[PDB]
Structure 1
Amino acid sequence: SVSSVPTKLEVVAATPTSLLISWDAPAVTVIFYVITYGETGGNSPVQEFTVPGSKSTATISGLKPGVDYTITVYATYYASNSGWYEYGSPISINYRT
């Protein structure tokens, strides 16, 4: 009944090199989303940025063509039930450019 995880995370447009992802926001009040991505192997470090909680999309750039990436989004949200902010559990996907 409480929604703190985004749902339906997907790549909606793509270059070989860049991605437009959207997700569906959860119920709760999100102050920002955290976006994380990196090569599914483990071969390169992992990159991370945030998006304002008002936004339910993000772009990802400078990826390598033809490589499998793992993309992850989680909400930093206000848990009204406890009285502090919380880093929500993430939703994740794989995508090959």
Structure 2
Amino acid sequence: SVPTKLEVVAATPTSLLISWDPAVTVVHYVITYGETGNSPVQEFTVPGSKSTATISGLKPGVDYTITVYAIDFYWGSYSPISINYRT
């Protein structure tokens, strides 16, 4: 499901640099991130012309869950893709 790929590129003691692969124009990407398994998940959007985003303000020693799903202009959102990263 698009984005078919996802990974943490750079990372930082209290920051993250994620990236994703689409062969189809998308409006924007809905990026949300939260600790695996207890708190409301924070949400923010990134324009569809970008292939990367920055997530900061985290906490060390916490296993986060980063889910990303694109949004088609006419047909809505796609299926999300999850990933894990322990700070």
Cα pair distance change 1:70/1:86, threshold 3 Å: closer
* Residues 30 and 69, structure 2, Cα contact 8 Å, conserved in 1: yes
Shift of 1:86: 3.6
Q: Which residue of 2 aligns with 1:80?
A: none
* Structure 1 spans left out of the alignment, 5+ residues: 76-83
Give the % identical residues: 95
2:54 is aligned with 1:59: yes
Equivalent position to 1:36, from 32, 53, 66: 32
Would you tell me which structure has more strand in proportion to its own residues? 1
Matched residue SS, 1:59? strand
Who is 2:15 aligned against? 18
Aligned residues: 83
Shift of 1:16: 1.6
> What value does the CA root-mean-square deviation take over the aligned residues?
1.3
Gaps of 5+ in 2: none
Q: Is the 8 A contact 2:69 2:77 kept in 1?
A: no
Can you list the C-alpha shifts for 1:3-38, whole angstroms capped at 9, x where unaligned?
Answer: x511220000111211000000x1221000000100
Check whether the contact 1:36–1:47 (CA below 8 A) recurs between aligned residues.
yes
CA contact (8 A) 1:70 1:95 kept: yes
TM-score, length-scaled by structure 2: 0.87
Q: Normalized against structure 1, the TM-score is what?
A: 0.79
Please state if 1:85 is matched with 2:76. yes
In 1, are the aligned partners of 2:28 and 2:48 still within 8 Å (CA)? Answer: yes
| Bigger Cα Rg | 1
